[PDB]
Design a protein around this ligand. Sequence first.
Ligand SMILES: Cc1cc2nc3c(=O)[nH]c(=O)nc-3n(C[C@H](O)[C@H](O)[C@H](O)COP(=O)(O)O)c2cc1C
Length: 362
Amino acid sequence: EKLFTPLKVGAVTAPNRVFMAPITRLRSIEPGDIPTPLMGEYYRQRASAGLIISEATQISAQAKGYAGAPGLHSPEQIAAWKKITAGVHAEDGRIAVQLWHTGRISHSSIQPGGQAPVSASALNANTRTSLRDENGNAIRVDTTTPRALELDEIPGIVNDFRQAVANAREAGFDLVELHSAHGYLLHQFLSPSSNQRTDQYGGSVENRARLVLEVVDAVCNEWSADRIGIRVSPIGTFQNVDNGPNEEADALYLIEELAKRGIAYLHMSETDLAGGKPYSEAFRQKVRERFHGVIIGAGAYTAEKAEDLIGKGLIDAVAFGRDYIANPDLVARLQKKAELNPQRPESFYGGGAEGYTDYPSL
Ligand SMILES: Cc1cc2nc3c(=O)[nH]c(=O)nc-3n(C[C@H](O)[C@H](O)[C@H](O)COP(=O)(O)O)c2cc1C
């Protein structure tokens, strides 16, 4: 077994390879999109993870697409996250913040000024997002058609990622994960399906990857490359965003570019909850010979599959989502081959402590 051995992840050393995937839970305070002490308890319970990766967190108010998702742009958000990371560190854990801009997976009612959300192009996502009703309960609502960003608005988006990384470092996070997956803003630019621009930010793969690489460079300069990870979902379809007709070649272009920056890790979300074709081992080997940081795999993994791929020299760590929702001591359970707590999906999104902090350890 290698799952219970240490791994150097940029500037941090994880004691095991069992990571907590980023999981949106929609329990923040409104107004202000403020993290809470309840969220702090939830993360502290999971501090034995080799690395915790937080729920997706807004870089700015414009970044918001889901009612109840936290931000990392305001003074009050910084102060609340500082308490949360201090609690994880008091339990000897490590925590990364996942930073996003939702782009077109959003609704005008939760944008600044009630305006349409932004994207690469003025194309509706044709999906839903999560709002709150008048009683504070999570509800699903069709996405609003976005406005295409003007060329002169792109530097501001880059700066918003940079600023959020400055804030994250101050807030005590160990690493930052850029959310470049699942059809959110960075992925909206990467994918030809969602990006019909004819300027330097659309068309060729070089142009489609331009924004995400500008963001990577800005955040490495703000902090250090060994503090930066990135999550991609570059093979298959996620939230109606496919990866275009040359997905493998385009993914390998992006990964070779990322490798040049010496970033801490590449986190691959391999399939959504409905599943799909597995990554081929040939593709995994092409990724591995191009990237020389840590590779994290995710998407309906088992411990056995993680061991197999770590033993083949193809990935370094696994991130578990739903098993981490339900098992605060997932590491110990996998080590001991114990049963896993029964999951309660009704309480994944929204609500309070029930189905959040009430799953027991062994
Ligand atoms: C309730 C829920 C919320 C999620 N929120 C995020 C998120 O904030 N960021 C992200 O990149 N992926 C998110 N995901 C995907 C998970 O990180 C993970 O990749 C996925 O759950 C598949 O892995 P699993 O079979 O281990 O659960 C979410 C998944 C679920 C079920």
